[PDB]
Amino acid sequence: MSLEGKVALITGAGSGFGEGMAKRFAKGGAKVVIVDRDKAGAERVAGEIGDAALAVAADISKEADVDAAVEAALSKFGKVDILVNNAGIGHKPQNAELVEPEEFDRIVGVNVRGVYLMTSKLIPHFKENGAKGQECVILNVASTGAGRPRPNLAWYNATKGWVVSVTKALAIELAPAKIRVVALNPVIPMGRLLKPDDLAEAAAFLCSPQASMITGVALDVDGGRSI
Amino acid sequence: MSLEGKVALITGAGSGFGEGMAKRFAKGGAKVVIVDRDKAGAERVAGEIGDAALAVAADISKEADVDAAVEAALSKFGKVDILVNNAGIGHKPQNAELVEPEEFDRIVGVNVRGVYLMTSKLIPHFKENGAKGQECVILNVASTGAGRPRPNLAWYNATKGWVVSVTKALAIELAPAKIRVVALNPVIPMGRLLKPDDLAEAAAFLCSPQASMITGVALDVDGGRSI
Amino acid sequence: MSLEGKVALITGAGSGFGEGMAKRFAKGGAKVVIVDRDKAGAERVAGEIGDAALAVAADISKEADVDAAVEAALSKFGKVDILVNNAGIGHKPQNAELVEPEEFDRIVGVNVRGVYLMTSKLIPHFKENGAKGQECVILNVASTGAGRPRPNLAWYNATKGWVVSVTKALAIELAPAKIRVVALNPVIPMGRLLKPDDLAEAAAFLCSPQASMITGVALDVDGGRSI
Amino acid sequence: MSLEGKVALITGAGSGFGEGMAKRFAKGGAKVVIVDRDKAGAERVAGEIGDAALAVAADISKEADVDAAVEAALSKFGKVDILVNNAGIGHKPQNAELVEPEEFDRIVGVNVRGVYLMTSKLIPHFKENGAKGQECVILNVASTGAGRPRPNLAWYNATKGWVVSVTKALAIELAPAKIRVVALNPVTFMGEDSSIPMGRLLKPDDLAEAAAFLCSPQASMITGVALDVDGGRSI
Known part of the structure; x- marks a missing residue:
């Protein structure tokens, strides 16, 4: 019941961690907009969640797709309260200098430009919500590789540092607008793998009113791997 | 299931943040051991909570008081699953060089030795539980002063850095024993004060099975103050 | 004479910090390749240093300009031992959501893609030098805003986080190849402004054999701003 | 000659990193006060440097020893410009719960109380130098284990977090008084002689060079930092 009434838009939500988060948010009473490049993925997750979910196929590196995604969410649910920037692509592990410009550019397009586009496009609506006293949350999924890289994912890890x-930066800027901005760093000392439901719980906590005084942080969820 | 069935020993539990946590944990279905140098404070808090709380007067800077506290917790509740090192004393803000050795040594004795004593005394018990499948948590309450100091609390802030x-250090070492070790840094951009309520919610999340993959972290709860 | 016999390529070296480092490096006996989008400014700085300097006009966001710059460096001086990534652009301070895509992408082109291009194009050469017993250094000029942003420079500050x-990431990957990778964060409790020569000295230190055991760090040079 | 005319007091200077720093600072023109609990060690290092060096026997965990140490430095050299907090003790690697209170107390006494004593007793003099236009520096030697611990050294590492x-904390408070406060994180606890991404081990001279840079006017805008010197170990 923690997220009852809230509307979350979640990118990369057609699979893995994004799917885990959307299912968990919906179980908490939230309406979920399932945004993914994979249309079959988005539709399947929407189906499994049920009436609380809207499926939206989009390539968030593209301005037009972001605009369409945002319009569809607004049209279906009337507002957005929570944005989870979760979509991300990598390169296969290799010597940094072997990643070529096309691949590098694609990675930046999703992991950097996508976040920029999705966020800047929803900020005015969030500010409007905050003025009526409805607090909003932007949650960015990054990685332990951002601050604790191992060799061979240089360009991918750097996007996560971004x-x-x-x-x-957004957290300090948007706080007075009543918009919180947080991040999760998923990855082992605990001796087991990270599952989507683990990350989902940290996400539901950070996006809930139980975390209303928490902003600008990056929470490692990693079995102690970043230590 | 979150905190149901758990036993939490919380130091400095006779007021402030410590009291907030004890009441929040008890509401979650936990048993709570209320440890404080202030006997009347410990008894007041324990009586405000009722049958699930045990009062223990103790000066955690003293080894024999820690031992008696651990012994009374185990005598009463059979086990301890959660330790919250919350007890702390500071100095009146002042030029660093004006804090005298006697006062300095007192601050260290609670904030540093007290943590060492209470933690090292519960670890063998925590390892036994963990080996039997009952994961344990150590929660340390520090401060945003540890990494983001402002003038005039130098020796207090440094104990929080400790x-x-x-x-x-404890997290990486104890993770294989199935003991998590986490920290909270309580403090304003969010435009309002931090209450014991707020910090208690974060403590309840981090000490729950919903945080089973979170260890080694220090989470700021500060309304963005430290950005 | 600490940098005697070394060749440094410095981007954005036609003014400001870049120019200060170029002159300081040359005073330490290095040959310097002055790279800048502003041809007349690269020429100015090169001319002021003398025979030890080569002016090179380049838009480092374009692969063709990077390849040409590296070729010209190798053609003139036979090798490059030090790469300083210092070229950067930003936006007028303003609300994040008001920075439009064309401007966002241009910033990324210089601050993100330009560093990737210049760095990846030199790594094979640095690896060759490393195998011949010659230690190479990549110095990245970031900003205090990367980790301590103030409102209104969100996307700029983010590139600096990248x-x-x-x-x-590169430090961990390339350490075995005898290539150090370090960063500086220029900015105030010390009460005065940061000058090019202040940063220049930190740079000359980090790029010299006196720092042969220093890699993967970001050194704040900020009169205490980041504390 | 970057430190010519400056006076540096260095703790744990009887061996290892501290002895390395002391010789390096003296080669740069500084007078050096060699403070160590091992009296014979302090006297050896001072004798190996010459007239620029003064040996001081002190257990810096003790206020009385610290008072005498400071008085001796001022009476010999007239002033102190640089303080290096380098002395440190640890415990043998073991399960954290096996370090007993008496050993724990000893470690805090040197690594924590010792830094508090030496620094708080020099601050009023450092503020006088500052007011006269003479910049001072406090350099603290911590460790990569403070922010990047490995198991078995819990209580040692935690003193280094402190x-x-x-x-x-001191950097921000003391900056307007013209006192910088900086730290070094090197990866045996005091660097004494008889895996690493960079492919060799840290030597006292590597650490000494970083310290010499941080304590010089070439670093006049650097304060509040903790600089890792670890061959990439902490990344």
């Missing part, structure tokens, strides 16, 4: 840094 | 650092 | 993160 | 945190 995400953590943008989280702090 | 707390953040020991959280990390 | 740079600090890429410093760590 | 060092890093106090460096930040």
Whole structure:
């Protein structure tokens, strides 16, 4: 019941962690907009969640797709309260200098430009919500690789460092507008793998009124791997 | 299931943040051991909570008081699953060089030795539980002063730096024993004060099975103050 | 004479910090390749240093300009031992949501893609030098805003977070190849403004053999701003 | 000659990193006060440097020893410009719960109380130098284990977290008095002689060079930092 009444828009929500978060948010009483590049993925997750979910196929590196995604969410649910920037792509592990410009550009398009587009497009609506006293949350999913890289994912890890840094910058700027901005760093000392439902719980907590005084942070959820 | 069935020993539980946590944990179905140098404070808080709370007067800077506290917790509740190192004393803000050795040594004795004593005394018990499948949590309450100091609390802030650092060291070492070790840093951009309520919610999340993959972290709860 | 016999390529070296480092490096006996989008400014700085300097006009957001710059460096001086990524652009301070895509993308082109392009194009050469027993250094100029943003520079500050993160990732990956990768964060409790020569000295230190055991760090040079 | 005319007091200077720093600072023109609990060690290092060096026997965990140490430095050299907090003790690697209170107390006494004593007793003099236009520096030697611990050194590492945190707290408070406070994080606890991404081990001279840079006018706008010198170990 923690998120009852709230509307969350979640990117990369057709699979893995994004799907886990959307299912968990919906179980908490939230309406969920399932945004993914994979249309079959988005539709399947929407189906499994049920009436609380809207499926939206989009390539968030593209301005037009973001605009369409946002319009569809607003049209279906009347407002957005929570944005989870979760979509991300990598490169296969390799020597940094072997990643070529096309691949590098694609990675930046989703992991950097996508976050920029999705966020800047929803900020005016969030500010409007905050003026009527309805607090909003932007949650960015980054990675332990942002601040604790191992070799061979240089360009991917750097986009995640961008995400953590943008989280702090937006948080200090948007706080007085009643918009919180947080991040999660998913990855092992605890001796088991991270499952989508683990990350989902941290996300539901951070996006709930139980975390109303928490903004600008990057929470590691990683079994102690970043230590 | 979250805190139902758990036993939490909380230091400095006779007022402020410590009291807030004890009441929040008890509401979650936990048993709580109310540890404070202030006997009347511990008894007041324990009576405000009722049958699920046990009062224990103790000066955690003293080894024999810690032992008696651990012994009374186990005598009463059979086990301890959660330790909250919350007890802390500071100095009146002042030029660093004006804090005299006697007062300095007192601050260290509670904020540093008290943590060492209460934690090292519960670890063998925590390892036994963890080995039997009952995961345990150590929660340390530090301060945003540890990493983001402002003038005139130098020696107080440094003991909080000690707390953040020991959280990390204990977490990496105890993770294989299935004991998590985490920290909170209570403090304003969000435009309002932090209440014991707020910090208690974060403590309840981090000490729950909903945080089973979170260890080694220090989470700021500060309305953005430290950005 | 600490940098005697070394060749440094410095981007954005036609003015400001970049120029200060170029002159300081040359005073330490290095040959310097002055790279800047502003041809007349690259020429000015090169002319002021003398025979030890080569002016090179380049838009580092374009692969063709990068390849040409690296070729010209190698053609003139036979090798490059030090790369300083210092070229950066930003936006007028303003609300984040008011920075439009064309401007957002241009900032990324210089601050993100330009560093990736210049760095990846030099790594094979740095690896060759490393195998011949010659230590190479990549110095990334980021900003205090990366980790301590103030409102209104969100997307700019984010690119600087990308740079600090890429410093760590490349440092871990390339250490075995005898290539150090370090960052500086220029900015005030010390009560005065930061001058080019202040940063220049930190740079000359980090790029010299006196720092041969320092890699993966981001050094704040900020009179205490980041504390 | 970057430190010519400056006076540096260095703790744990009887061996290892501290002895390395002391010789390096003296080569740069500084007078050096060699403070160590091991009296014979202090006297050896002072004798190896010459007239620029003064040996001082002190257990810096003790206020009385610290008072005598400071008085001796001022009476010999007339002033102190640089303080290096380098002395440190640890415990043998073991399960954290096995370190007993008496050992724990000893570690806090040197690594924590010792830094508090030496620094708080020099601050009023450092503020006088500051007011006269003479910049001072406090350099604290911490460790990569403060922010990046590995198992078995919990209580040692935590004292080094305290060092890093106090460096930040004192830096912000003391900056307007013209006193910088900085820290070094090197990866045996005092660097004494007879895996690493960079492919060799840290030597006292590596650490000494970083310290010499941080304590010089070439670093006049650097304060509040904790600089890792670890060959990439902490990344």
